[PDB]
Design a protein around this ligand. Structure first.
Ligand SMILES: Nc1nc2c(ncn2[C@H]2C[C@H](O)[C@@H](COP(=O)(O)OP(=O)(O)O)O2)c(=O)[nH]1
Ligand SMILES: Nc1nc2c(ncn2[C@H]2C[C@H](O)[C@@H](COP(=O)(O)OP(=O)(O)O)O2)c(=O)[nH]1
Ligand SMILES: Nc1nc2c(ncn2[C@H]2C[C@H](O)[C@@H](COP(=O)(O)OP(=O)(O)O)O2)c(=O)[nH]1
Ligand SMILES: Nc1nc2c(ncn2[C@H]2C[C@H](O)[C@@H](COP(=O)(O)OP(=O)(O)O)O2)c(=O)[nH]1
Ligand SMILES: Nc1nc2c(ncn2[C@H]2C[C@H](O)[C@@H](COP(=O)(O)OP(=O)(O)O)O2)c(=O)[nH]1
Ligand SMILES: Nc1nc2c(ncn2[C@H]2C[C@H](O)[C@@H](COP(=O)(O)OP(=O)(O)O)O2)c(=O)[nH]1
Ligand SMILES: [Mg+2]
Ligand SMILES: [Mg+2]
Ligand SMILES: [Mg+2]
Ligand SMILES: [Mg+2]
Ligand SMILES: [Mg+2]
Ligand SMILES: [Mg+2]
Lengths: 132, 131, 132, 131, 131, 131
């Protein structure tokens, strides 16, 4: 039933004034905020931990540089089937109706991260909320 | 082209203050209200009749309990291809862009019913609007 | 504390697809629907009763004709200080922020009626909801 | 891949006061206006050229009639993958989440046109914005 | 009393993706577009004429600079009491419920201009729409 | 011009799912989040300190009870004239167009606190963000 998932609101959301728009979409599907931190600039080690599965890719450093270019919010959301449901809400830039489908048009500047699995959720929550 | 369909706004929509949000999505798709009733509490007999096709399912009684747990609005909507279009608007909890997709996250508490066929529409309209 | 007020959603709201927009504004201020009726065309006697205080004015018949030109919803709303608060939400065509201020621009086609006093509320509710 | 595409806001959008709603959906996806013309009533020749590929279909003249029945806005939008993305945003009357999916319910009165290919985009831009 | 008024959507509205939001507030009040021009960068002369009455103020040239720092839309709107009503809709940065009250927070970068009188409306329309 | 102010999102905003709606209104007015904390339950001592100027009022204890009845968000916002502008956005339950005017209808459960002066802002920021 109940799950917790990790969401990042990305620097481009701040730049484009879409923070509340994104949070509102998750809130409207009835998911609750369990933990939340605002980072004026997230420490790079946290970002590199978060994206460690990508450490070998050509885009790794550039993506980290983006994620450090402005503020981030890290949020733990709770609700039924939260991991998959918030992943679906995130969507992609090809799918209207979703956060990325309605609001994003870039492979990197895509507004929001949501955990993609039970395993990744557990790990991302411990990165951003280790006092847990 | 022109059809009529039956919509129920469920008790969870009242509890969560989403009645206008739901009705607004249908209105914006250019469907028109032909008939509408507000029930502070719907008669259990009407609920059991509405969900008669589910009477042998494990969830039948609990669902009926939920459907009488608060107010409901029954609406007849009219427009081109209304039955399937409003069904598509209803959607499901997995599909963002739809009413249930954007707003609901429960197998039972899912905000809206819309008729799924011509036969069920005629039957459901008859139930809520016997006049 | 708690009051009930009578709201009419006018034919122009139907014509312009603003029914839910208007109802949403009242719902968002936390007022609850206690009674509601949809009228494909309201009987004229009800409209003339509703506007009886205006029976002598030059605009009486024309206003009644408008109120009968399309569907109406009659709603009883309940909440703290409902009469005055919903009156304020209705507002007027000069006051942005209000239903009429944001959405209406006519002396007659102004989308919504809300009871203006305790006395008028009691009387309007009994017109539209006599089985009460 | 930066692209430019042609959008028409149709007379039904003006009639239904949905012009800003439509433009806003495109604006929110980060597409930029490159040029724009308002036509209180579009010259018929421009409409016939626009739908030239449809001249042998039974609906051609009634569709043209509709397209001159009220104002039109023609817009050149620019952005990454604009042709395909704005086409997707336009969507269809069956798919909620899109402009047509949320707002339209007719085969003819469907609110918006967006170029469907690189070739048609070049051609449609030359019709509405020959300069 | 049917009137026509001149509206400018300013470069900050384009920068902040608020063009449709602004136009939508006017559209929802039932005002109609009579003409519209998009300016990727407005000719400076047009801007200097528009703010001619301010030519002796200290902010004149910096204000002009801002007004050519990005695109502009000039619109002629029509409706009952349009000059006063659209002026009121524009509002000020202190008053929530209005365009500037909800969306702007600067003396210069304030999103929208609306004609403030019958005389200025006639004059502003002649600048932007001389034809 | 530039100021910082302290905002609390109150427990009733969480209960009614209005957190983003409230934050969205401030964001749209171009104010920026400088600091933010989520409290699943705020320490009563912090609440009593925040409302210290009310300690001799009849409603003090009940208000504190309410303020610890659910989660709160404390936010420092920054922008031009932030203290009074965000105060104006907060508004009151009588004034439509504002946060409390559109969304609240209670003397206690009123969704948002915003600092009302420079002195109270410095003091309130110090309370919630002692760092
Ligand atoms: N191919 C490619 N991929 C990129 C580039 N920059 C960033 N990315 C990837 C890194 C991330 O996995 C993804 C966006 O961030 P995210 O939080 O992982 O979302 P998602 O990809 O799981 O849906 O985009 C890039 O420049 N090229
Ligand atoms: N599958 C399922 N449905 C439940 C449960 N509890 C209540 N329901 C209700 C909610 C659905 O709106 C209603 C009918 O759903 P179907 O999925 O039965 O819909 P339909 O056959 O009317 O088109 O059953 C439940 O526990 N499981
Ligand atoms: N002066 C004038 N007043 C008119 C005209 N047509 C309608 N009215 C009045 C009748 C109503 O009192 C008012 C609008 O309806 P309502 O439900 O009474 O709202 P309100 O006037 O109490 O705010 O407009 C009209 O043509 N001229
Ligand atoms: N298929 C079809 N199209 C019609 C009819 N009447 C008007 N039209 C217009 C609406 C369409 O936008 C226009 C072009 O046809 P299309 O390429 O199938 O649609 P589309 O690419 O705009 O989605 O034809 C009609 O009766 N049938
Ligand atoms: N008063 C003032 N106005 C400035 C300044 N810099 C740019 N402006 C511009 C913004 C105003 O829209 C424009 C015209 O002045 P106005 O008539 O007082 O404002 P308004 O009628 O557009 O609300 O002057 C400035 O520094 N002070
Ligand atoms: N006046 C009043 N205020 C109450 C009551 N119960 C709780 N409160 C709280 C809600 C207000 O946000 C808080 C402070 O309001 P003021 O009106 O005291 O605001 P301020 O002095 O912080 O600017 O007092 C109550 O019963 N009456
Ligand atoms: Mg990923
Ligand atoms: Mg179902
Ligand atoms: Mg009256
Ligand atoms: Mg086509
Ligand atoms: Mg001026
Ligand atoms: Mg207060």
């Amino acid at each position: 039933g109940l799950q917790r998932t990790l969401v990042l609101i990305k620097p481009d959301a701040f730049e484009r004034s879409l923070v509340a728009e994104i949070m509102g979409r998750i809130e409207k599907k009835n998911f609750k905020i369990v933990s939340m931190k605002f980072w004026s600039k997230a420490p790079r080690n946290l970002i590199e931990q978060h994206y460690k599965e990508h450490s070998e890719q050509s885009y790794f450093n550039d993506n980290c540089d983006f994620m450090v270019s402005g503020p981030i919010i890290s949020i733990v959301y709770e609700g039924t089937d939260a991991i998959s449901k918030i992943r679906r809400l995130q969507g992609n830039i090809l799918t209207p109706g979703t956060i990325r489908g309605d609001l994003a048009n870039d492979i990197r500047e895509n507004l929001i991260h949501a955990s993609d699995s039970e395993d990744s959720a557990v790990d991302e929550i411990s990165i951003w909320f280790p006092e847990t």
